[PDB]
CSV table of C-alpha atoms and ligand atoms in Angstrom, one decimal:
chain,number,residue,atom,x,y,z
A,1,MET,CA,8.7,6.5,16.9
A,2,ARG,CA,8.1,9.2,19.6
A,3,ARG,CA,8.5,8.3,23.3
A,4,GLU,CA,7.3,10.1,26.5
A,5,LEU,CA,7.5,9.3,30.2
A,6,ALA,CA,5.5,10.2,33.5
A,7,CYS,CA,6.1,9.0,37.1
A,8,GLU,CA,3.3,7.6,39.4
A,9,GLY,CA,0.6,10.2,40.1
A,10,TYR,CA,1.9,12.6,37.5
A,11,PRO,CA,-0.2,12.9,34.2
A,12,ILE,CA,1.0,11.9,30.7
A,13,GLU,CA,0.1,13.8,27.5
A,14,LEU,CA,0.7,12.6,23.9
A,15,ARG,CA,0.7,15.5,21.4
A,16,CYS,CA,0.5,15.0,17.6
A,17,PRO,CA,1.7,17.5,14.9
A,18,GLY,CA,-1.4,19.7,14.3
A,19,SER,CA,-3.9,17.5,12.4
A,20,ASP,CA,-2.4,14.0,13.1
A,21,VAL,CA,-3.7,11.3,15.5
A,22,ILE,CA,-2.0,9.1,18.2
A,23,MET,CA,-1.3,5.3,17.4
A,24,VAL,CA,-0.1,3.3,20.5
A,25,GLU,CA,2.6,0.8,19.3
A,26,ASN,CA,4.3,-0.1,22.8
A,27,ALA,CA,3.4,0.6,26.5
A,28,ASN,CA,4.1,-0.4,30.1
A,29,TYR,CA,3.2,0.9,33.6
A,30,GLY,CA,5.8,-0.2,36.2
A,31,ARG,CA,9.6,-0.3,36.4
A,32,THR,CA,12.2,-1.5,33.9
A,33,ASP,CA,15.3,0.5,35.3
A,34,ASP,CA,16.2,1.8,38.8
A,35,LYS,CA,17.6,5.3,37.7
A,36,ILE,CA,14.2,6.6,36.4
A,37,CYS,CA,11.7,8.5,38.7
A,38,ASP,CA,13.9,8.9,41.8
A,39,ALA,CA,11.9,8.7,45.1
A,40,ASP,CA,13.3,5.9,47.3
A,41,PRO,CA,16.3,3.5,46.6
A,42,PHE,CA,14.4,0.7,48.4
A,43,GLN,CA,11.4,1.3,46.1
A,44,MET,CA,13.7,1.7,43.0
A,45,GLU,CA,15.1,-1.9,43.6
A,46,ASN,CA,12.4,-3.8,41.7
A,47,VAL,CA,13.5,-3.5,38.0
A,48,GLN,CA,11.3,-6.4,36.8
A,49,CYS,CA,7.8,-4.8,37.4
A,50,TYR,CA,5.5,-5.1,34.3
A,51,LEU,CA,1.9,-4.4,33.3
A,52,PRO,CA,1.1,-5.7,29.7
A,53,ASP,CA,-2.5,-4.5,30.1
A,54,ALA,CA,-1.2,-0.9,29.8
A,55,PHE,CA,-1.5,-1.2,26.0
A,56,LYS,CA,-5.4,-1.4,25.8
A,57,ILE,CA,-5.8,1.3,28.6
A,58,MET,CA,-3.7,3.8,26.5
A,59,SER,CA,-5.1,2.7,23.1
A,60,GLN,CA,-8.8,3.1,24.2
A,61,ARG,CA,-8.0,6.8,25.3
A,62,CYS,CA,-5.3,8.1,22.9
A,63,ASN,CA,-6.0,6.6,19.4
A,64,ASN,CA,-8.1,8.5,16.8
A,65,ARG,CA,-7.2,11.7,18.8
A,66,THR,CA,-4.5,14.4,18.6
A,67,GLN,CA,-4.1,14.7,22.4
A,68,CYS,CA,-5.1,12.5,25.5
A,69,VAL,CA,-5.4,13.3,29.2
A,70,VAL,CA,-4.2,10.1,30.9
A,71,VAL,CA,-3.0,10.1,34.5
A,72,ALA,CA,-0.4,7.4,35.5
A,73,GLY,CA,-2.3,6.7,38.8
A,74,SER,CA,-3.8,3.8,40.8
A,75,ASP,CA,-7.4,4.9,39.9
A,76,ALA,CA,-7.1,4.3,36.1
A,77,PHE,CA,-4.2,1.7,36.2
A,78,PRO,CA,-4.1,-1.5,38.3
A,79,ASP,CA,-1.0,-1.7,40.7
A,80,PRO,CA,1.1,-4.7,39.4
A,81,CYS,CA,3.9,-4.6,42.1
A,82,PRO,CA,2.8,-3.4,45.6
A,83,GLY,CA,5.4,-1.4,47.5
A,84,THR,CA,7.4,-0.2,44.4
A,85,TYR,CA,7.4,3.3,42.7
A,86,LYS,CA,6.1,3.2,39.1
A,87,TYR,CA,6.3,5.2,35.8
A,88,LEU,CA,4.5,5.0,32.4
A,89,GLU,CA,6.8,4.4,29.3
A,90,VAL,CA,4.9,4.8,26.0
A,91,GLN,CA,6.3,4.4,22.4
A,92,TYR,CA,3.9,5.9,19.8
A,93,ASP,CA,3.6,7.3,16.2
A,94,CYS,CA,1.4,10.1,14.7
A,95,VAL,CA,-0.5,9.4,11.4
A,96,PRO,CA,-2.1,12.1,9.1
A,97,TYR,CA,-5.2,9.9,8.5
A,98,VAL,CA,-5.5,6.3,9.9
A,99,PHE,CA,-7.5,3.7,7.9
A,100,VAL,CA,-9.5,0.5,8.8
A,101,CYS,CA,-11.5,-1.9,6.5
A,102,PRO,CA,-15.0,-0.7,5.8
A,103,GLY,CA,-16.4,-4.1,4.8
A,104,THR,CA,-16.8,-6.7,2.0
A,105,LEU,CA,-17.2,-5.6,-1.7
A,106,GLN,CA,-20.5,-6.6,-3.5
A,107,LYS,CA,-21.9,-4.5,-6.4
A,108,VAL,CA,-20.1,-1.4,-7.8
A,109,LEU,CA,-22.5,1.6,-8.1
A,110,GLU,CA,-22.3,4.4,-10.8
A,111,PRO,CA,-22.5,8.0,-9.2
A,112,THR,CA,-20.0,10.9,-9.9
A,113,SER,CA,-19.1,11.0,-13.7
A,114,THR,CA,-16.6,13.5,-15.2
A,115,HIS,CA,-16.4,14.8,-18.8
A,116,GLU,CA,-14.9,13.2,-22.0
A,117,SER,CA,-11.2,13.9,-21.4
A,118,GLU,CA,-8.6,15.1,-24.1
A,119,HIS,CA,-6.8,11.7,-24.2
A,120,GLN,CA,-8.1,8.1,-24.5
A,121,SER,CA,-5.6,6.5,-22.1
A,122,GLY,CA,-4.3,7.7,-18.7
A,123,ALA,CA,-4.9,7.5,-14.9
A,124,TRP,CA,-6.1,9.8,-12.1
A,125,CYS,CA,-5.9,9.4,-8.3
A,126,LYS,CA,-6.5,11.5,-5.1
A,127,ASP,CA,-3.9,11.4,-2.3
A,128,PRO,CA,-5.4,9.1,0.5
A,129,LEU,CA,-3.2,10.8,3.1
A,130,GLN,CA,-4.1,14.4,2.2
A,131,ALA,CA,-7.6,15.6,3.1
A,132,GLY,CA,-9.2,17.6,0.3
A,133,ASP,CA,-10.2,17.4,-3.4
A,134,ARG,CA,-6.7,17.5,-4.9
A,135,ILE,CA,-6.8,15.5,-8.1
A,136,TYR,CA,-3.6,14.2,-9.8
A,137,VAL,CA,-4.3,13.5,-13.5
A,138,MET,CA,-1.7,11.7,-15.6
A,139,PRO,CA,-2.6,11.3,-19.3
A,140,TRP,CA,-1.0,8.4,-21.2
A,141,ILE,CA,0.5,8.8,-24.7
A,142,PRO,CA,2.7,6.0,-26.2
A,143,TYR,CA,6.5,6.4,-26.0
A,144,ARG,CA,6.1,10.0,-24.7
A,145,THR,CA,4.3,9.9,-21.2
A,146,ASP,CA,6.1,12.3,-18.8
A,147,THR,CA,3.8,14.9,-17.1
A,148,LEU,CA,1.3,14.9,-14.2
A,149,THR,CA,-1.2,17.8,-13.8
A,150,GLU,CA,-2.7,18.9,-10.4
A,151,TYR,CA,-6.4,20.0,-10.1
A,152,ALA,CA,-8.0,21.8,-7.0
A,153,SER,CA,-11.4,20.0,-7.3
A,154,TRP,CA,-13.8,18.1,-9.6
A,155,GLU,CA,-15.2,21.5,-10.8
A,156,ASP,CA,-11.6,22.7,-11.4
A,157,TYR,CA,-10.8,19.7,-13.7
A,158,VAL,CA,-14.0,19.8,-15.8
A,159,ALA,CA,-13.4,23.6,-16.3
A,160,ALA,CA,-9.8,22.8,-17.4
A,161,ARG,CA,-8.5,25.1,-14.5
A,162,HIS,CA,-5.2,23.4,-13.4
A,163,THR,CA,-3.1,24.3,-10.3
A,164,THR,CA,0.4,23.0,-11.3
A,165,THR,CA,2.3,20.8,-13.9
A,166,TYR,CA,4.9,18.2,-12.8
A,167,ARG,CA,7.6,17.3,-15.3
A,168,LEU,CA,8.8,13.8,-14.3
A,169,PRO,CA,12.6,13.0,-14.8
A,170,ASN,CA,11.8,9.5,-16.3
A,171,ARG,CA,9.1,8.5,-18.9
A,172,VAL,CA,6.1,6.4,-17.7
A,173,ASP,CA,5.6,2.8,-18.7
A,174,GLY,CA,1.9,2.2,-18.0
A,175,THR,CA,-1.3,3.9,-16.9
A,176,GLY,CA,-2.4,2.8,-13.3
A,177,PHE,CA,0.2,4.6,-11.2
A,178,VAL,CA,-0.3,5.9,-7.6
A,179,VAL,CA,0.2,9.1,-5.4
A,180,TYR,CA,1.2,8.5,-1.7
A,181,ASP,CA,2.0,11.4,0.7
A,182,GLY,CA,2.8,13.8,-2.1
A,183,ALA,CA,5.1,11.2,-3.8
A,184,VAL,CA,4.3,9.7,-7.3
A,185,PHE,CA,5.1,6.0,-7.7
A,186,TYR,CA,5.6,5.2,-11.4
A,187,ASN,CA,7.4,2.5,-13.6
A,188,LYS,CA,10.4,3.8,-15.6
A,189,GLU,CA,10.1,3.3,-19.4
A,190,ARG,CA,12.2,0.3,-20.9
A,191,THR,CA,13.0,-0.9,-17.3
A,192,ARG,CA,11.5,-3.0,-14.4
A,193,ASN,CA,12.2,-0.3,-11.8
A,194,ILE,CA,9.7,2.0,-9.9
A,195,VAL,CA,10.6,5.7,-9.2
A,196,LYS,CA,9.4,7.7,-6.1
A,197,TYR,CA,9.2,11.4,-7.2
A,198,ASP,CA,8.1,13.5,-4.3
A,199,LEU,CA,6.1,16.5,-5.6
A,200,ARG,CA,6.2,17.9,-2.1
A,201,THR,CA,10.0,18.4,-2.3
A,202,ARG,CA,10.0,18.5,-6.2
A,203,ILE,CA,13.1,16.1,-6.2
A,204,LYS,CA,13.6,12.3,-6.8
A,205,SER,CA,13.7,10.3,-3.5
A,206,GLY,CA,14.2,6.6,-4.3
A,207,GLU,CA,14.2,3.9,-7.0
A,208,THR,CA,13.8,0.1,-6.6
A,209,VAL,CA,14.3,-2.5,-9.4
A,210,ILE,CA,11.5,-5.1,-9.4
A,211,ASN,CA,13.2,-8.5,-10.2
A,212,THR,CA,11.7,-11.2,-12.5
A,213,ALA,CA,8.9,-8.7,-13.4
A,214,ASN,CA,8.3,-8.5,-17.2
A,215,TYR,CA,8.6,-4.9,-18.4
A,216,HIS,CA,7.6,-2.7,-21.5
A,217,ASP,CA,4.7,-4.3,-23.4
A,218,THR,CA,6.1,-7.8,-22.5
A,219,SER,CA,3.3,-8.7,-20.0
A,220,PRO,CA,0.7,-5.8,-20.0
A,221,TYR,CA,-3.2,-6.0,-19.7
A,222,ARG,CA,-5.6,-7.3,-22.4
A,223,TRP,CA,-5.4,-4.0,-24.4
A,224,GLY,CA,-1.6,-3.8,-23.8
A,225,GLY,CA,-0.1,-0.3,-23.9
A,226,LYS,CA,3.0,-0.7,-21.5
A,227,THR,CA,0.7,-1.6,-18.5
A,228,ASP,CA,3.2,-4.4,-17.3
A,229,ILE,CA,3.2,-2.8,-13.8
A,230,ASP,CA,0.0,-1.3,-12.2
A,231,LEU,CA,0.4,0.3,-8.7
A,232,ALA,CA,-2.5,0.4,-6.3
A,233,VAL,CA,-3.1,1.7,-2.7
A,234,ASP,CA,-5.5,0.0,-0.2
A,235,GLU,CA,-6.3,0.0,3.6
A,236,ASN,CA,-3.1,-2.1,4.2
A,237,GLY,CA,-0.7,0.2,2.2
A,238,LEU,CA,1.3,0.3,-1.0
A,239,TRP,CA,1.1,-2.6,-3.6
A,240,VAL,CA,2.9,-3.3,-6.8
A,241,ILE,CA,0.9,-5.6,-9.3
A,242,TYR,CA,2.9,-7.2,-12.1
A,243,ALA,CA,3.7,-10.6,-13.8
A,244,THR,CA,6.8,-12.9,-13.7
A,245,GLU,CA,8.2,-16.0,-15.5
A,246,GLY,CA,8.2,-17.7,-12.0
A,247,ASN,CA,4.3,-17.6,-11.9
A,248,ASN,CA,4.2,-18.1,-15.8
A,249,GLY,CA,2.2,-15.1,-17.1
A,250,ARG,CA,0.1,-15.0,-13.9
A,251,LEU,CA,-0.2,-11.9,-11.6
A,252,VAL,CA,2.5,-11.4,-8.9
A,253,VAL,CA,1.2,-8.9,-6.2
A,254,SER,CA,3.9,-7.7,-3.8
A,255,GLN,CA,3.7,-5.3,-0.8
A,256,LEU,CA,6.2,-2.4,-0.9
A,257,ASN,CA,7.2,0.1,1.8
A,258,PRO,CA,6.4,3.7,0.6
A,259,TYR,CA,9.3,5.3,2.4
A,260,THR,CA,12.1,2.6,2.7
A,261,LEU,CA,11.3,1.4,-0.9
A,262,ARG,CA,11.8,-2.2,0.4
A,263,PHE,CA,9.5,-5.2,-0.1
A,264,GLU,CA,7.3,-6.7,2.7
A,265,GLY,CA,6.5,-10.0,0.9
A,266,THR,CA,5.7,-11.5,-2.6
A,267,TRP,CA,2.4,-13.4,-3.4
A,268,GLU,CA,1.3,-15.6,-6.3
A,269,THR,CA,-2.1,-15.6,-7.9
A,270,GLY,CA,-3.9,-18.0,-10.3
A,271,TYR,CA,-5.1,-15.4,-13.0
A,272,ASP,CA,-3.5,-14.5,-16.3
A,273,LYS,CA,-2.4,-10.8,-16.9
A,274,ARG,CA,-2.7,-11.1,-20.7
A,275,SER,CA,-6.5,-11.8,-20.2
A,276,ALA,CA,-6.9,-9.2,-17.3
A,277,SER,CA,-8.2,-5.7,-17.8
A,278,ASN,CA,-6.9,-3.8,-14.7
A,279,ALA,CA,-6.0,-5.0,-11.2
A,280,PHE,CA,-6.5,-2.9,-7.9
A,281,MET,CA,-6.2,-3.7,-4.2
A,282,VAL,CA,-9.0,-3.5,-1.5
A,283,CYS,CA,-8.3,-4.4,2.2
A,284,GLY,CA,-5.3,-6.6,1.1
A,285,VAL,CA,-7.6,-8.5,-1.4
A,286,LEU,CA,-6.9,-8.4,-5.2
A,287,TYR,CA,-9.6,-7.7,-7.7
A,288,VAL,CA,-9.0,-8.3,-11.5
A,289,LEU,CA,-11.2,-6.7,-14.1
A,290,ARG,CA,-12.3,-8.6,-17.3
A,291,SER,CA,-13.3,-6.9,-20.6
A,292,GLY,CA,-19.1,-9.3,-20.2
A,293,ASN,CA,-17.6,-6.5,-18.1
A,294,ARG,CA,-17.2,-7.8,-14.5
A,295,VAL,CA,-14.7,-8.9,-11.8
A,296,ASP,CA,-14.3,-12.7,-11.5
A,297,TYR,CA,-11.0,-13.2,-9.7
A,298,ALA,CA,-10.0,-12.3,-6.1
A,299,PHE,CA,-7.0,-13.4,-3.9
A,300,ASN,CA,-6.6,-12.7,-0.1
A,301,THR,CA,-2.8,-12.1,0.6
A,302,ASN,CA,-3.4,-12.1,4.4
A,303,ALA,CA,-5.0,-15.7,4.1
A,304,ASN,CA,-2.8,-16.8,1.1
A,305,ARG,CA,-6.1,-18.3,-0.4
A,306,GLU,CA,-8.1,-17.2,-3.5
A,307,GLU,CA,-12.0,-16.9,-4.0
A,308,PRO,CA,-13.5,-16.7,-7.5
A,309,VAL,CA,-16.3,-14.2,-6.6
A,310,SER,CA,-18.0,-13.3,-9.9
A,311,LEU,CA,-19.5,-9.9,-8.9
A,312,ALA,CA,-21.2,-7.2,-11.1
A,313,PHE,CA,-19.2,-4.2,-12.4
A,314,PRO,CA,-20.7,-1.2,-14.5
A,315,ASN,CA,-20.0,-2.0,-18.2
A,316,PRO,CA,-18.6,1.2,-19.7
A,317,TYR,CA,-16.9,0.9,-23.2
A,318,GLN,CA,-14.7,-1.7,-25.0
A,319,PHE,CA,-11.6,0.4,-24.1
A,320,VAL,CA,-10.6,0.4,-20.4
A,321,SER,CA,-7.4,2.4,-19.6
A,322,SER,CA,-7.0,2.2,-15.8
A,323,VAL,CA,-9.0,1.1,-12.7
A,324,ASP,CA,-7.5,2.1,-9.3
A,325,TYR,CA,-9.0,2.1,-5.7
A,326,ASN,CA,-8.7,5.0,-3.2
A,327,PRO,CA,-9.0,3.8,0.5
A,328,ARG,CA,-9.8,7.3,1.9
A,329,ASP,CA,-13.2,7.9,0.1
A,330,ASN,CA,-13.7,4.1,-0.6
A,331,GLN,CA,-14.4,4.9,-4.4
A,332,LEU,CA,-12.9,3.7,-7.7
A,333,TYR,CA,-11.0,6.1,-9.9
A,334,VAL,CA,-11.6,4.9,-13.5
A,335,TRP,CA,-10.2,6.3,-16.7
A,336,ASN,CA,-11.5,4.5,-19.8
A,337,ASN,CA,-12.0,5.5,-23.5
A,338,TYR,CA,-11.6,9.3,-22.9
A,339,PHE,CA,-14.4,9.3,-20.2
A,340,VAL,CA,-13.1,9.7,-16.5
A,341,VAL,CA,-15.4,8.3,-13.7
A,342,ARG,CA,-15.8,7.8,-9.9
A,343,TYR,CA,-17.8,4.8,-8.5
A,344,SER,CA,-19.3,4.3,-5.1
A,345,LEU,CA,-19.2,0.7,-3.5
A,346,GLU,CA,-21.4,-1.8,-1.7
A,347,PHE,CA,-20.2,-3.0,1.8
B,1,NAG,C1,11.4,25.5,-13.0
B,1,NAG,O1,12.5,25.0,-13.7
B,1,NAG,C2,12.3,24.9,-15.1
B,1,NAG,C3,13.6,24.3,-15.7
B,1,NAG,O2,14.8,25.0,-15.2
B,1,NAG,C4,12.0,26.2,-15.8
B,1,NAG,O3,11.7,26.0,-17.2
B,1,NAG,C5,10.7,26.8,-15.1
B,1,NAG,O4,10.4,28.1,-15.6
B,1,NAG,C6,10.9,26.9,-13.6
B,1,NAG,N1,9.6,27.3,-13.0
B,1,NAG,C7,9.4,28.4,-12.4
B,1,NAG,C8,8.6,29.4,-13.1
B,1,NAG,O5,9.9,28.7,-11.3
B,2,CA,CA1,-5.1,-1.0,-11.2
């Protein structure tokens, strides 16, 4: 994380790479060390001067912005130690697009519907970190799934006008995969491991074996078809939805770091995967499809408590391939029985 300093009276400016925005993670206005901002050795003596309130002052002015004009003076900041020279030490990070929870899910709408695709099963998702209409379409074919196609826009996909073709080094084992910061997260065929293939660099950059998780048609969805592992991205981050022997057939949702490829916890839900249609994450809350085509189960990982909220979902066809949520547009990317569809939501 980036760090910048400015003495008492001198302004501080936090710059972000081009389109990115400031995110304050640590801040203090005072003195921690004597050697910094030389003025008077008598004034430099107090090395225990702190102002914890400096966080909110910086966060209110710098966040959701590329740059911020903040002056480390007595006018904007309160003096914590009178008769001591001060400096502002700020530890921050730049984000391409920051995301916050829009609200609570109620009824799923029906707008934006695409044509009858070439294949019955597959998955499609937009990059939540990249601003634009870049569509990553991955058609699923049994025992030979291996290529992702790129499309410039909704108009570009319906007209069969593709931008590029990506030949993955491993075969895909399931439909509902996910694209995060130009990197594809997919399950390897005949294995419990997930591969991170960065399309940006066009080279493999990580692989993590998911322990106790049932792989390759062992524990897929109601229709089957190698969907043992279904990746989803929400407002919180990256999630890996699967089923273990430890939970006994039930869904095991776990948070995974997109860059370190390490786990940030493991949760247990009370809903069968063999009865489930397709699971996706929204604001850290799980939602499991049932196909009587509606979502009945929901589990809050942040609260570690479930809620059986039987809420309406648009009934498409008897064959549902993949249902994944995109937190950027707050829409549902659904591939089911050839037909590919977007869906707006109630908040
Ligand atoms: C990329 O590499 C593959 C395999 O070596 C080759 O078939 C393909 O033509 C290359 N793409 C181009 C046109 O650069
Ligand atoms: Ca899903």
